[PDB]
Design an enzyme around this catalytic site. Structure first.
Site, mmCIF file in Angstrom:
data_model
loop_
_atom_site.group_PDB
_atom_site.id
_atom_site.type_symbol
_atom_site.label_atom_id
_atom_site.label_comp_id
_atom_site.label_asym_id
_atom_site.label_seq_id
_atom_site.Cartn_x
_atom_site.Cartn_y
_atom_site.Cartn_z
ATOM 1 N N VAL A 1 -71.505 12.150 -16.045
ATOM 2 C CA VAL A 1 -71.678 13.143 -14.944
ATOM 3 C C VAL A 1 -70.618 12.973 -13.838
ATOM 4 C CG1 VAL A 1 -73.252 12.645 -12.965
ATOM 5 C CG2 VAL A 1 -73.890 14.345 -14.702
ATOM 6 N N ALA B 1 -61.911 7.794 -9.323
ATOM 7 C CA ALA B 1 -60.946 6.677 -9.480
ATOM 8 C C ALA B 1 -61.676 5.326 -9.438
ATOM 9 C CB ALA B 1 -59.883 6.760 -8.413
ATOM 10 N N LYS C 1 -73.250 3.880 -11.649
ATOM 11 C CA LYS C 1 -71.753 3.861 -11.569
ATOM 12 C C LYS C 1 -71.248 2.519 -12.071
ATOM 13 C CE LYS C 1 -68.245 3.628 -8.110
ATOM 14 N NZ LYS C 1 -67.824 4.069 -6.759
ATOM 15 N N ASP D 1 -69.794 8.234 0.421
ATOM 16 C CA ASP D 1 -68.336 8.191 0.118
ATOM 17 C C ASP D 1 -67.569 7.806 1.380
ATOM 18 O OD1 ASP D 1 -68.796 8.652 -2.602
ATOM 19 O OD2 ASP D 1 -67.650 10.537 -2.688
HETATM 20 O O1 LIG Z 1 -69.881 4.330 -5.096
HETATM 21 C C1 LIG Z 1 -71.213 4.508 -4.667
HETATM 22 C C2 LIG Z 1 -71.756 5.801 -5.262
HETATM 23 C C3 LIG Z 1 -71.299 7.049 -4.819
HETATM 24 C C4 LIG Z 1 -71.818 8.237 -5.335
HETATM 25 C C5 LIG Z 1 -72.805 8.170 -6.308
HETATM 26 N N1 LIG Z 1 -73.453 9.324 -6.837
HETATM 27 C C6 LIG Z 1 -74.826 9.639 -6.613
HETATM 28 N N2 LIG Z 1 -75.191 10.743 -7.237
HETATM 29 C C7 LIG Z 1 -74.037 11.206 -7.907
HETATM 30 C C8 LIG Z 1 -73.870 12.354 -8.681
HETATM 31 C C9 LIG Z 1 -72.610 12.599 -9.194
HETATM 32 C C10 LIG Z 1 -71.512 11.718 -8.952
HETATM 33 C C11 LIG Z 1 -71.665 10.578 -8.196
HETATM 34 C C12 LIG Z 1 -72.942 10.331 -7.668
HETATM 35 C C13 LIG Z 1 -73.249 6.935 -6.770
HETATM 36 C C14 LIG Z 1 -72.724 5.760 -6.239
#
Ligand SMILES: OCc1ccc(-n2cnc3ccccc32)cc1
Ligand SMILES: [Cl-]
Ligand SMILES: [Cl-]
Ligand SMILES: [Cl-]
Ligand SMILES: [Cl-]
Ligand SMILES: [Cl-]
Length: 345
Positions: free
Chosen positions: A26, A30, A49, A161
């Protein structure tokens, strides 16, 4: 220690605890690869992640430590938090892979952006409520923009982010959203910047919710500075003194002087309390902008402001940022942070 299972998802090996099921790719940034999953422990849809090459250089090892420390600290309704962190490694000796688990985000602000004045009040309220919490820990976001704000069907918002000092020159060049929301002092390296840069970004976001248009869509850094100064006016001697670069001072003095415009004639039809708040956020001299805590008490937010429910953070120690260490020293600090993690109630 949980039981881990292995599987290859789009050219990558994922080894995760049994509690995480039905993984589907999903994401493709980077920092790492991202899968959607069902958590059988909590019942939540979650984002998993997997960091890429977290310890390939001192720079990368320290970035990995920085991001884990930050995500372990943030415990606020309007900020991204950490549900879990895990490694399949049984010892420091075999430690190579780090996985982060958060609630699964759907829409960003771009995806939801027709909005009433009541939608703008509630959305900007939640950004300030989360910012007051962030700034109270002496953390600077440095990258607020609509793509960094997650929003659900109920208009509930979270900030994500955080700028890990990652953004590149080529990424900031030309007709790009990556630069449109940045404060002019940090866009052109005028001075040591501070947390006020985030308030400038919130003003660009609120203006865009009110009009449906980007406030400063510059075609390069110089075009964008011309759009900014035509709105807020050219600087006086008091701000000119505070620009440390002689060359940035000389370039500014080359520009013909311009007065601040009437924001009621720019934001035509907007709630007058919305116009008054924008004048307080979009101030060129960063020393003079409204703070997050001051903005929460502005009459624009009267129907949401509750001073007994705008919490502050625990203290946040960033002494590691001035520390010089070896790759294996940062990796060892990262390991201890993974193994000490305590999940939320
Ligand atoms: O790096 C930490 C961090 C940032 C964003 C996320 N994240 C949460 N829901 C998401 C859906 C799509 C892409 C990234 C997503 C998880 C972890
Ligand atoms: Cl498990
Ligand atoms: Cl969360
Ligand atoms: Cl590992
Ligand atoms: Cl964006
Ligand atoms: Cl701390």
């Amino acid at each position: 220690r949980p039981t881990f299972y292995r599987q290859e998802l789009n050219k990558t090996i994922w080894e995760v605890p049994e509690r995480y099921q039905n993984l589907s790719p999903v994401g493709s940034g980077a920092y790492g690869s991202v899968c959607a999953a069902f958590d059988t422990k909590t019942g939540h849809r979650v984002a998993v992640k997997k960091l890429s090459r977290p310890f390939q250089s001192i720079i990368h090892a320290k970035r990995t430590y920085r991001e884990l420390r930050l995500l372990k600290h943030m415990k606020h309704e309007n900020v991204i938090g950490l549900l879990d962190v895990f490694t399949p490694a049984r010892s420091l000796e075999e430690f190579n892979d780090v996985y982060l688990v958060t609630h699964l985000m759907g829409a960003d602000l771009n995806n939801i952006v027709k909005l009433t004045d009541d939608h703008v009040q509630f959305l900007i309220y939640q950004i300030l409520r989360g910012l007051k919490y962030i700034h109270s820990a002496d953390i600077i976001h440095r990258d607020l923009k609509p793509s960094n704000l997650a929003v659900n069907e109920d208009c509930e918002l979270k900030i994500l982010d955080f700028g890990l000092a990652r953004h590149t020159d080529d990424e900031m060049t030309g007709y790009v959203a990556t630069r449109w929301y940045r404060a002019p002092e940090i866009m052109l390296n005028w001075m040591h910047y501070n947390q006020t840069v985030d308030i400038w970004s919130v003003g660009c976001i609120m203006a865009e919710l009110l009009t449906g248009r980007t406030l400063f869509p510059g075609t390069d850094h110089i075009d964008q500075l011309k759009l900014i100064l035509r709105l807020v006016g050219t600087p006086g001697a008091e701000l000119l003194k505070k620009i440390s670069s002689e060359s940035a001072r000389n370039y500014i003095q080359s520009l013909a002087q311009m007065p601040k415009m009437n924001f009621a004639n720019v934001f035509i039809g907007a709630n007058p309390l919305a116009v008054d708040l924008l004048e307080k956020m979009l101030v060129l001299d960063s020393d003079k902008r409204i703070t997050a805590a001051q903005a929460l008490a502005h009459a624009y937010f009267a129907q949401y402001h509750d001073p007994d429910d705008e919490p502050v953070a625990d203290p946040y120690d960033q002494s590691f940022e001035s520390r010089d260490l070896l790759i294996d020293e940062w990796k060892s600090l990262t390991y201890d942070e993974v193994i000490s993690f305590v999940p939320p109630p």
